[PDB]
Amino acid sequence: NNWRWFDDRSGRWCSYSASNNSTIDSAWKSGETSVRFTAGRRRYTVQFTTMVQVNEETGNRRPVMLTLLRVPRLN
Amino acid sequence: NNWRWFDDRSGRWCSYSASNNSTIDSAWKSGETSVRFTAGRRRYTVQFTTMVQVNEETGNRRPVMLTLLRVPRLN
Amino acid sequence: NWRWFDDRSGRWCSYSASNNSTIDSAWKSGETSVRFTAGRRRYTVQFTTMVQVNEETGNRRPVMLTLLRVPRLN
Amino acid sequence: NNWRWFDDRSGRWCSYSASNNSTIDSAWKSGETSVRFTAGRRRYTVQFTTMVQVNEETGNRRPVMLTLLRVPRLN
Ligand SMILES: Nc1ncnc2c1ncn2[C@@H]1O[C@H](COP(=O)(O)OP(=O)(O)OP(=O)(O)O)[C@@H](O)[C@H]1F
Ligand SMILES: Nc1ncnc2c1ncn2[C@@H]1O[C@H](COP(=O)(O)OP(=O)(O)OP(=O)(O)O)[C@@H](O)[C@H]1F
Ligand SMILES: [Cl-]
Ligand SMILES: [Cl-]
Ligand SMILES: [Cl-]
Ligand code: NA
């Protein structure tokens, strides 16, 4: 649950499924500039150079974020 | 120019003014959970626990992000 | 992505692929520390102080986590 | 005070003075590859491309680190 996408309808950041988070995070860690994934009948590209997810069918843009863990870690 | 808010009308992340970026970043660094700033008389609150900016005149919620620079630096 | 500083050489040093994966798996899991071995020596990484501890001698060497830029560059 | 330097004598990361932290952090945020500061009777260079600080009088090297705050912030 390290990646999130923003929902403008509700005004909240939302989690991805475990499998879609893994697909996104694997591409992030591999140095890719973008990644494609599917959810049901929906098709998306996450653009890491802009931190935006684009619906491939409609062009709708949803912002994305990467959660960050504190360094150093707290006790 | 390290903080950004997402403009849903244009579909792009946007920088704050130098003054507003400083107000936000100083609150971030001091451990505050939120911060108020203005653009002229227009009032906003950034909520750091949700990474959302609340327009205190329209109520619209826009996501925010903190840009992160690479560690170590290149070159 | 994890590095330890070698004061003998004056440089940050990478871990082996397996030790990097062990450390990073504990980091991502939210643990406060992680055990590994290097060269028949036992070590603990303490994430709350960002140091590696030699379990035999007590010697502390600093560690660091490299960070990727957000957003990514084109 | 977000920057730290490692003290091998005590085995701990240590904070900078407010002013020296500010000098370092301003160069960091400005995109510079290194920065010099003076503390006491010594000049030091922080090399951001290696995350190492060099004492320019003696040549002694100490590792540095940049603390990171959690995103999003906890309540
Ligand atoms: N309630 C909702 N309203 C509108 N749109 C939604 C949505 N809930 C998810 N979406 C869209 O869907 C993407 C993947 O969201 P995600 O949770 O990974 O989707 P699924 O559970 O179907 O995953 P999977 O079964 O592995 O394909 C997400 O960015 C968002 F764009
Ligand atoms: N106790 C100590 N032992 C060994 N070395 C030390 C040290 N204390 C500071 N150093 C050296 O000096 C640098 C700046 O350390 P810093 O605290 O910003 O400098 P000042 O002393 O001017 O601070 P202040 O007393 O608060 O005004 C620091 O990286 C390190 F290299
Ligand atoms: Cl949006
Ligand atoms: Cl969509
Ligand atoms: Cl020194
Ligand atoms: Na040295």
Residue numbers in the entry:
A (entry chain A), B (entry chain B), D (entry chain C): 1615 to 1689
C (entry chain D): 1616 to 1689
Quote the study on this structure:
The WWE domain is a relatively under-researched domain found in twelve human proteins and characterized by a conserved tryptophan-tryptophan-glutamate (WWE) sequence motif. Six of these WWE domain-containing proteins also contain domains with E3 ubiquitin ligase activity. Here, we present novel crystal structures of the HUWE1, TRIP12, and DTX1 WWE domains in complex with PAR building blocks and their analogs, thus enabling a comprehensive analysis of the PAR binding site structural diversity. A highly conserved feature in all determined structures is the recognition and therefore the interactions involving the adenine ring of the ligands.
